[PDB]
């Protein structure tokens, strides 16, 4: 885990993923990679791994799944609330996405 | 332009550690607290000691500090022990009457853990109304599986619609919103003057 | 390695193409606008590129499905069932630029939010190559004429060589085509359905000698 | 060049009636039967005299003929009463470890009544691996509803992915397959900058 | 209970709203020079059937594809009220139903 | 009902449909029209009506529904296993689609 | 209060003080001012206010009181563990001194 | 980092870590060098830690669980912003006899004190630590000696008096971080002449 | 102008031959002369030809006409009854904190089973008086600690900020030109840390 | 004992002592020698022995003990209230010190 | 039980140790032409008294001041063993006891 | 404002001082070492400063206590009881530097751990002024001779003026004296007791052993 919630602004979801959840069999992980616009390729913000839980007992698509598919397809800049919890994605740690809001302009995403 | 101030009853009885507001709640902002005389008076009354609290984009220096609100950055003070959180849901008590907004496009999506999918419906590049849907809570939970399909379609294709809302539930999911947000009850892709609208 | 040979499906006969070649609709050299199909719409056609594919199988597959449509139209009593399709074998030069290569260069220059994931996915899948402004007759080598009789189910395939063709040891440009950032409003990637083909690839082949149905790829990529 | 041979144990005791192999089973092929010496040995002891059996791409002649595997076009041998079927699911008993294949595209779909949805993952025009998911059976059956949505998208878009499988269950849905087929556990869209493919 | 069949119409309108207590999705089928065909489906009562969700998804797909459609509409017991959608077909893409 | 299972190769799903199931109310039919590539308009293989059952008690999309949508959208040639059972579609009989596999090449689909 | 324990190194106690404890009458506060060696006069580390509790029910001098008097008299550099709790000293906040250790060299006090 | 330091045995670690980098009274934060020098603690932590959890040490971090058990260098209190800090109990009943142990020609240096716990001094000779000795009124067998010992210790500390220090090895203390000396219960201070019976 | 002790402080049964009881001290001529109300009470209680003792004088009986006659320190202690005043007075004032910056602890005072007092001076002038005792008062538990810091600042002469409570007023210093209150705190001056 | 309380002015505590109390074991004596400034060596005021009681049941230092230490260390002139009671010190009688006040100037200490 | 009064000696040694169960403090008084005077005080029967703490503090003060002292030492019942300290006096600072 | 007049207590008579003056023990100009009293110890006296006080009352108080010590010595049979003390009135110039001012400048230059709180407290309390290397006879204005007879208790105070004194409109240096960081081992501030007086102030007045203790070891009670 990370000590506190990180707020990453002007983030574009570059890739999406699906994988099982190690600790709970009745749940799974909806993962992805987000990139900060204008950030250097060497910077860690240029490829931020993230994951969020999905209840396998409940049928359908959760609000976070619906938004992720739409914002990924349209490459929309986001304001992401990541952590404190860390999950596993491609053998490496990934911050838990707890909330996401699309950017309106310079005021909410400087 | 003016912003929507969440009423005093929206504040949680206890703050949140690690800058992680509980599900169905979100961090109170500087502009929202500054615009609320009710909250400022409530905090001055309950806050003790040399305690500094976190807001979404700043801090509240309470207790012996007097009740000073300082500007910051998004999540810039989440390293503090306590973050001020407001409940996103509010049962208005208003009637179930149909309220609609014509020639609107769904923009600026919002989602959070175990809560709701939200959209800002705009006209002439300006927000008109915010509307939300969820399978977890609310009077219209059974509408979610249906509304998410219509909303996804109109969002990705940029379709101009007539949006229907219920004012029985008001939401405060969007920070510093220049629009009110209610329960989404219908989406209509229709011709002008149609009975289907 | 860049390809020396590119292919193009068209409805135009060789007595026209072998003498006139292929000329682009306008001077809009914007990479994104072409790959999203915005510069290839009805009443908005000003693209400075001629769509070609390095894969013959891709052009063959499109012809085959256009042929099946003519059969479907006959069964619905909307046509004769007869179909004539052409696949032109074109020699590529430094005036031919990779569609996928040009797209990813545009996104690397103007940011991730300046592009569309499906526009890049389409360009790669189509194995597209964009020829700037014109494909002169001297580049068009051969043509495969595919005739079909919907009533009998007989398919006649005849090859024709171009007399105006000039042989050279040239290949497509190894560098991508670069353009200014698009100021136009782009909602999504315009595609023709059954099978999914880019708006520019499909519209350029179409000729009047019933408007084409174009949809945003983003609205059908995920199931409802 | 070499095709995957289904183990002897998969052979259905009471085969399909006039080509209709029961749910969870498909018709056995001539190349798969010719490649299995152990199954051919079992067949000679169970097959009675002057009896003709059906296959997908052939027919099998009884022990009185001398156990002859004769070729036929697809579904020609389906005219006969008993068809040779094989159970598509095999419990390998291998460790539940994660196995992945990078820069692969989802192609050649397969679906059957009350059974799996399969795909063939290809790289550089060559078949790498096969992956299946089903809401009816398997360890990862609860994950089907989600995996099918991403599989449909990557199939529609042709986007390169890293496919994750568990070799705990081996599938034999694809007839005369030059690739191994396992249970689909995950899909991750390629991101070279994020060290994915 | 009289049902009517319609062929080679296009989805011009698609709406999902509340009709009192129950949820209702309505579509408008259009053919040049013909009167508009309005067909609705309601989740009344309704017993746990994916029928409403399945048909809505199919109608959205038909709208998103901009394709021609074929539909069976059962007459409403109330005059003026749109009929009940029983069957929906997506005609050949870039083509017509026969 | 037809006597045995038919194996139709190089088939493209031209039309898709949804209708209720007459004998069972807890089930519905996912139907369509299949056509053999290059076949004559007069030939019966140019118009092959097909149907398959869908359980209304189970939420989501069945493997056959998912594949059907994808192969219809992309006009992919298939190997269709039709019959022996016959269902009703547009007042006329339609063969039951029990299994479908996409064509790999001219070997499996001649 | 402050979120976490601060570890201030090379600190010299410049002033000492005594005052009553507001919340508990059976306890009092032993306060002081600490200064970082080589720090700028404008810097907040050049005058760090601190306090620690003293049990008035117990007679004598506590280990912290004994050390404080000695390190103040001899101006010895220290490693001070301050916070998270904040107490009142001269109307302004002061960090709670929970532990202090004298500097041995540049290793423990860089 | 530095070897040859006193390693607190495995039984000193607390059952649960501490928030805000504030180890409970009578306990202190475990260091990088102490953990690196302890095979028992490293094995205990690898066994109990889960997930991608990073824990705080006094002057660094312990990347446990899925990280493998990596110990990284840091700064004093530089990682106290983390959720959990590893703490070790400062007191240990050795079980050793009450025999008198003394160290001649030593000067009291490097004082240590903490909330509701002992006052400590490092007794040195020729600029090198010989032994550490502690006195407390709150706990230990010799609590009644504190009010007396503190007066002697204050005097010898401020005036820099060379003494003979007496300790009891019945209680061992781990108050000092990365100590190149053992620390025991202070039982006597003697300002005496060489060979004196008063020593 | 000197501080006058209120009439109520006057001990009902005075000290025997100068020995004023614990918690009381001998009244002075200047303090008695400054209290008109006490002189009025004295005339009604003092019988005929009785002579009373004071610290720096004697008081003649009502037959003489109530005469306050001056004497050297302890000269009037030869007589049976000495006029004593209770050193502690409950003012009834709010328990608010009052402080005096840049003051030095001087002129100590101590008496049997009573208070330790000091006079806090700035620029050679008396500012305030502060007392502490382990036997009585609200801040009696704080004595053991305060006496250690008071001793140090007295020994060193270090400038301090003295904190007092005006809840209790003390009259230990005879003919004091300064007010005396209960010692609540001491803070050593630090100009860089905004102390004095 | 002496008949009345003596008030000795301009006295400096020249020596301090500690000894047990003969009549009570739960108490002890804090003794000393006081000398009048400028007085003749032959005069009895040049050497005034004094003692005061200390309760051994009570822990800590009494106000008289604290002042005595300070006035002895700094040789401060005092106003001493001695007697009427006489205690034993060095086999000879010593007046009981009941109260002491430091000299302010020529006025209080002539 | 014979007591001896020593005058104008200086504290040369001062030790605080444990003597079995009880706590003990010992001092050594020095004068140039004389033999060292060793005196000890024990906590033995002062478990409820403050006698030991008071005397120890006074002896430390006498040592810290480097002043001359006067002390009454009661003889030990055992020869060679230091005597019992009953009284201690700090002589005039920078001066002598008379 | 800096003082034009400083005072110094001494045992030396005017016949010697008005002709020679006051000369420092050595050339060790270290501020801390003087204010600590390390450069004023027996067998370590090498201080480059001459201790004087801007306060006459301070020098008067010290003389008064040295006088009482002579009476105490007589009562103990160690002296005659007779005492002669002198307080010299000296005109200060730019060679006279403030002791407290010089101390705080040293601490501001080399850090808080380089000083001692009581050394600064003492310098302020003594109102000390350090004259570098020498005080000439031309600077010494007047002397107050205080004679005391311990036996009778008679105090004789006589004033004497210096003929060699030069009248000038000069005052003490307004700037502090600066020196290099002390490399010597300093335990604490050396003081003479009853009353507390700095080692240098007390030792310089003494003329033919003095008990010096660390101020830190007596500042707090035991």
Author numbering:
A (entry chain D), F (entry chain E), G (entry chain J), J (entry chain K): 1 to 110
B (entry chain B), D (entry chain C): 3 to 199
C (entry chain A): 2 to 210, 221 to 235
E (entry chain F), K (entry chain L): 2 to 99
H (entry chain H): 1 to 199
I (entry chain I): 4 to 199
L (entry chain G): 2 to 209, 222 to 235
What does the paper say about this structure?
One of the most important virulence factors of B. pertussis and an obvious target for improving current aP vaccines is pertussis toxin (PTx). This exotoxin is a multimeric, 105 kDa protein, composed of five subunits arranged in a typical A–B structure. Ribosylation of these G proteins impairs the binding of G proteins to the G protein-coupled receptor, on the host cell membrane, promoting adenylate cyclase activity that causes an increase in the intracellular levels of cAMP.
From these, a variant with a double mutation in the S1 subunit substituting Arg9 by Lys and Glu129 by Gly (PT-9K/129G) has been shown to completely abolish the toxic effects and has displayed the lowest enzymatic activity of the many variants generated. In addition, the space group between PTx and gdPT was the same with nearly identical cell dimensions and crystal packing interfaces. In PTx, Arg9 forms hydrogen bonding interactions with Ser52 and Asp11. When examining the effect of the E129G substitution, all interactions at position 129 (His35, as well as the hydrogen bonding with Gln127) were lost. The changes in the hydrogen bonding network due to either R9K or E129G mutations did not modify the shape of the catalytic pocket. These results indicate that the double mutation does not alter the overall architecture of the active site, despite changes in the hydrogen bonding network surrounding Arg9 and Gly129 residues.
